[PDB]
Amino acid sequence: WNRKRISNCVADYSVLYNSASFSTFKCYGVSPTKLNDLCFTNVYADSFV
């Protein structure tokens, strides 16, 4: 699985959650509707199939 790092930028999580292209969008430790109001020290996007 390939790990892309995200740091030092402004993240818009509303575009991804509001997009209907995703079969499931389920979140642990956070509620996605509030993701736009949080500040994260680092984010790791690990992608695979």
Binding site: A20, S31, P32, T33
Partner: protein, 49 residues
């Protein structure tokens, strides 16, 4: 509702219809009944009502 939004109709659930259309309380007493109706709610050419 649409088919696999059926589990958005539940207490403490998030999604499109669980927050914008029909929100149940956390302390919801009662219960949910769902049955497929592809017969009188579906028509060729699309039902847009």
């Amino acid at each position: 509702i649409r088919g696999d939004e059926v589990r958005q109709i539940a207490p403490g659930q998030t999604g499109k219809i669980a927050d914008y259309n029909y929100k149940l309380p956390c302390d919801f007493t009662g219960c949910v009944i769902a049955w497929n109706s592809n017969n009188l709610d579906s028509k060729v050419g699309g039902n847009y009502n």
